[PDB]
Amino acid sequence: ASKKSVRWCTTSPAESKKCAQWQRRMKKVRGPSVTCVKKTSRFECIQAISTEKADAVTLDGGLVYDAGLDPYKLRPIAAEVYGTENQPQTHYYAVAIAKKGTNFQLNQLQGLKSCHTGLGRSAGWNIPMGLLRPFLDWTGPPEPLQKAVAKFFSASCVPCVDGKEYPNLCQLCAGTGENKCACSSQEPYFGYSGAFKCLQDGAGDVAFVKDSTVFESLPAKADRDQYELLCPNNTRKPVDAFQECHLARVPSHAVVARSVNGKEDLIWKLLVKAQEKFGRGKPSAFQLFGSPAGQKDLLFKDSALGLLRIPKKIDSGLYLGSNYITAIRGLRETAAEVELRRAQVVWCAVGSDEQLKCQEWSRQSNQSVVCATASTTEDCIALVLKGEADALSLDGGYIYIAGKCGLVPVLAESQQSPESSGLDCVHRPVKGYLAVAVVRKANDKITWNSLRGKKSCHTAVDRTAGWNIPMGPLFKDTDSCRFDEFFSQSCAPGSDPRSKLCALCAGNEEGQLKCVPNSSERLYGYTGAFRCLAENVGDVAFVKDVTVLDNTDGKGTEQWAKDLKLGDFELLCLNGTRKPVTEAESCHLPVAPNHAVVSRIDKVAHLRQVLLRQQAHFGRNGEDCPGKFCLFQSKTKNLLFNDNTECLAKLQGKTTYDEYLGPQYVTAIAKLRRCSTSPLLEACAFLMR
Ligand SMILES: [Fe+3]
């Protein structure tokens, strides 16, 4: 029955053939034992693996999706690798090209002529025609997809397709005789390269090929500039903008295994030894990645140059992505179910009252906002990342994990500023706060850059202007992460009580809680960012520009901030120079940015619209705010949105993540985030290879 080995899942006799000997040579060299389980379809193998009848099998992204789905739940453990040694790639973007000139956008495709690579394909048929599902005018399944496509474009050239029922879909192909529209290279507009020649020649207005096609068809760079790419936001972009202007990303075939009790490590150790002893470029005849004579891609791909262990964070949907899973869902869904998902917002929520506030908002909204919930902020972001949720209102550090995973700022949380505004904000800009490093003018050995040695005043350990940014750019150049081996003695409330990081700290009236992250440790907050500096303890202090000119002039608490002018404090200064806190408008660190609402670039416009309206009934000036539910008002905990925000206000040419956060901000946050690692960020970076 079952031993210590790994049971592979063969689907053909020829597939079990290769495995019958894979198992034999594997005992012979001594490397993990492997036995075969032969079924009849990969679908079969899904079920056998899923109930302990087999342990491993490699599948397509269509079947990865389905194997990680409700009943079965297997996961991607290893990617295949394609290309040459110089350039191995794990995946690629399915892309839509068009002549530079034509001012048609993805939305206005209806009624143009298309060139496709081949019916039922990926890149050429399934990816583009499942994404366009909305505009198609298609009932769903038993209806041949192909007559909704027959009606949508005027003429086209979809290779494999029957020019018999539907002749315009074969209409623009270029084969003669009994090869016109053939489903081989005897139809000269077949493939990536023929879908492109279809377009170059003038037969279609768009081609659906992949990232590479133009680069491979037109070397020159001169020629390639007579083309644009249509992005999913409805714009056009040059042909190397495919990374940010693409239709879908297509993963390399994966080996899957069970999530519970999957035997991963075993399967992976078996895979390293046969890759090591029989893989591409090996001495042998038994080659893992290589098949017989009429036998193709048995087991693995004959095209492949190795395997790769995929991060344990990654599951069925992150491996695939949202764009791919969407392309699959719209091909086999009911125009019914399709415009319900197309219209409403699922809100990733975090923890339970954030849970109950959205379901409160849900019923309240008469269901145009719905609720997915993750056990954390990261698992929320991965949910939106795989289409299981559309939104979440995120801080500036997560925004970057967010924008590093393909995601985008929708609406910003415009602060009203705790007390009083007057009366409109949606269109009033965002400001954001000028992060600043202040000094005493009784000090003169001290410039940004003359600082290792000095005393610091931090606001707290791990807050945005008082730690993360001052420590970001300060530590940027070097790649050491010892953020205590730069100042002599810093007071950073959050740090170790004995260290060079809590030595200046105040403590409770010079008494109790010393170097503690609250008001009980006096030299903490803005507050004691300006008070270890202002009482000659700190040489410098990390605050927002306001801690000075909302504390100087004669204003803090009894005794220190009293009789202190503000022209007594001369700002600092990154340039290398130094000026007074007044104009912190040239002499700042970043502007530490507003908490925003991040979604995918598809949801974006719908979402934007639905939150201007949400806010309009329940937002600060809710014509139902006091009256029903209240947008900004948490159950005392900054739930869903932050308590002191005036409104959600549109970004304004502040549309990218790094166009939003600021590039001083990205640096800060990039330095640090290598120092403190994120597995959603590991998982993210891996998925570009
Ligand atoms: Fe393809």
Ligand SMILES: [Fe+3]
């Ligand atoms: Fe802060």
